[PDB]
Amino acid sequence: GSRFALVTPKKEGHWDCSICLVRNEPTVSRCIACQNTKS
Amino acid sequence: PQVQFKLVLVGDGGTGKTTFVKRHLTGESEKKYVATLGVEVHPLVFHTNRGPIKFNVWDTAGQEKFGGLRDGYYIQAQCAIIMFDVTSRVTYKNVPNWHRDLVRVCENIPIVLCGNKVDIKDRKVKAKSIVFHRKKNLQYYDISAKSNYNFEKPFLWLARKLIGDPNLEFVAMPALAPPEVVMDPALAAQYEHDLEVAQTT
């Protein structure tokens, strides 16, 4: 339980697409799923 | 900064995918429309004994009725639900096509097979006929979207697989839309029994 609280995603430069919520790598500026530009 | 998974919800049109995802009230109020792909992403929070988990469930806008879905719909999926309608054999017959299209893009992600609409007395696809999951390392559940029957079970199984914790539990059910039909408790027990004796055979 508390001793094993799920670890938060540690994401440096990775971004969550604001349109479809897919996680993208720091290098790309366009979401690999919905193809919208980072926002 | 929260734990979340992309879950793709696939199956023949008319099997109840939209009705099913919509039971989760907060996932409906906070849903997000993806205009490029024609998708509504429902963020479904479940509260486990180790903290909250969010399933971002991708619901189609009906395009599955006229052809296959585009790659982008499947991209970066981390789990899946394949649904069919137990009152329509053809929707069960097409399950292998959906599974194939899934693993082509996503490979060996955990998948749950769901037979929907078991509230309807005149059931066509019965436990004895449901065997595709046994062949492919998939879990199966009967479900009735309109009565919330077994709503949490696909998500609990997926959560245990994704986290790697067979003792993961939901500390409470999510807030769900009130049932529109009653699921007969005896029919439910009968069906649960039918699935057990078929796992043995």
Ligand SMILES: Nc1nc2c(ncn2[C@@H]2O[C@H](COP(=O)(O)OP(=O)(O)O)[C@@H](O)[C@H]2O)c(=O)[nH]1
């Ligand atoms: N009796 C019963 N009807 C359902 C259930 N789920 C969906 N239906 C109906 O099946 C029809 C198709 O529903 P829908 O969610 O749009 O299917 P989808 O095309 O796969 O998204 C609709 O008329 C639903 O009301 C269920 O669990 N029980």
Ligand SMILES: [Mg+2]
């Ligand atoms: Mg639909």
Ligand SMILES: [Zn+2]
């Ligand atoms: Zn996106």
